Amino acid sequence: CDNIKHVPGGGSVQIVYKPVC
Amino acid sequence: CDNIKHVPGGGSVQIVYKPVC
Amino acid sequence: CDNIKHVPGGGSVQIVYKPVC
Amino acid sequence: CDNIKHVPGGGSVQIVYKPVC
Amino acid sequence: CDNIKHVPGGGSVQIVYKPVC
Amino acid sequence: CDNIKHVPGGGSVQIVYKPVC
Amino acid sequence: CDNIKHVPGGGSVQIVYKPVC
Amino acid sequence: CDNIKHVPGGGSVQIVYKPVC
Amino acid sequence: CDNIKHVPGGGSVQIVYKPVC
Amino acid sequence: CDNIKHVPGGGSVQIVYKPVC
Amino acid sequence: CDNIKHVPGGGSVQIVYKPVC
Amino acid sequence: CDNIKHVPGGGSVQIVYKPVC
Amino acid sequence: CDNIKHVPGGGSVQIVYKPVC
Amino acid sequence: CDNIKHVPGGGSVQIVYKPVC
Amino acid sequence: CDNIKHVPGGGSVQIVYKPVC
């Protein structure tokens, strides 16, 4: 990804599986 | 992705499977 | 990834499996 | 990755498996 | 990785398995 | 691919070129 | 692909070229 | 790939070239 | 790959070139 | 690879070139 | 791409972003 | 890419970002 | 890439970022 | 890459970052 | 890489960073 601004102001969960970035 | 501004102001869950970005 | 600004202001979990970055 | 600014202001967990960076 | 600024302001756990950086 | 049950009961040939799975 | 049940009961040939799955 | 059950009951050939899994 | 059950009951050949798993 | 159960019950050949696992 | 014969006889510029070939 | 014959007879610039070939 | 014949007859610049070949 | 014939007949610059070949 | 024939007939610069060949 690029220039991602992930600011949930709360619970944050990121679950990925076999990605190709 | 590009220039993503993810600001839910609350619970944030991201679940991905075998992506190709 | 590039220029990621991950600031949830809370619980942060990152789970990855066999990625290719 | 590059230029990652991981500042959750809270609990931070990073779990990776067989990555290729 | 490069230029990683990991400042959670809290509990920090990093678990990796057979990476290729 | 996921949950592939390849049971031809005979000759089986799989030829792939530069895939992105 | 998902939940593929390939059971030809005979000769099976699969030829692919530069796929994106 | 995941949960692949490759049981041809016969000749099995798998030929791959520059994959990205 | 994960959970691969390769049981051809016969001749088994696997040929790979410059993979990225 | 993980949890690979390679039981061909016969001739088994594995040929790899410059992999990145 | 395959069998590309790029012969502009002049200035040639190719700019790509996050492709999936 | 395959069988690319890039012969511009002049200035040649190739700029790519996070490709998946 | 395969069988690339890059013959610009002039200035040649190749710039890549985090590729997956 | 394979069988690359890079013959620019001039200035040649190759710049790569975190590749996976 | 394999069978690379890098013959620019001029200035040649190769700059790489954290590759995985």
Ligand SMILES: *Cc1cccc(C*)c1
């Ligand atoms: C943007 C992004 C998030 C998680 C994993 C990847 C490969 C990319």
Ligand SMILES: *Cc1cccc(C*)c1
């Ligand atoms: C934008 C994005 C989110 C999660 C995963 C990917 C590959 C991309």
Ligand SMILES: *Cc1cccc(C*)c1
């Ligand atoms: C952006 C990113 C997060 C976690 C793992 C990878 C390979 C990339």
Ligand SMILES: *Cc1cccc(C*)c1
């Ligand atoms: C950005 C990143 C996080 C954890 C592991 C890797 C290989 C990369």
Ligand SMILES: *Cc1cccc(C*)c1
């Ligand atoms: C960025 C990074 C974190 C942990 C392990 C590796 C190889 C890389």
Ligand SMILES: *Cc1cccc(C*)c1
């Ligand atoms: C399902 C599958 C078969 C062969 C190659 C790939 C990448 C995927």
Ligand SMILES: *Cc1cccc(C*)c1
């Ligand atoms: C379902 C399937 C068969 C062969 C190749 C791919 C990428 C997918």
Ligand SMILES: *Cc1cccc(C*)c1
């Ligand atoms: C499912 C699979 C078979 C052969 C090669 C790859 C990368 C994946």
Ligand SMILES: *Cc1cccc(C*)c1
């Ligand atoms: C599933 C698999 C078979 C052969 C080679 C690789 C990298 C993966």
Ligand SMILES: *Cc1cccc(C*)c1
């Ligand atoms: C699953 C596997 C078989 C042969 C070589 C590699 C790197 C992986």
Ligand SMILES: *Cc1cccc(C*)c1
């Ligand atoms: C044909 C082609 C040109 C540039 C980039 C890609 C992925 C493909």
Ligand SMILES: *Cc1cccc(C*)c1
């Ligand atoms: C054909 C091609 C040109 C530049 C980069 C890639 C991955 C492919």
Ligand SMILES: *Cc1cccc(C*)c1
């Ligand atoms: C064909 C090619 C040019 C530059 C970089 C890669 C990974 C591939």
Ligand SMILES: *Cc1cccc(C*)c1
């Ligand atoms: C074809 C090629 C050029 C530069 C770097 C890589 C990994 C591959």
Ligand SMILES: *Cc1cccc(C*)c1
């Ligand atoms: C083909 C090639 C050029 C420079 C560095 C690597 C790892 C590969």
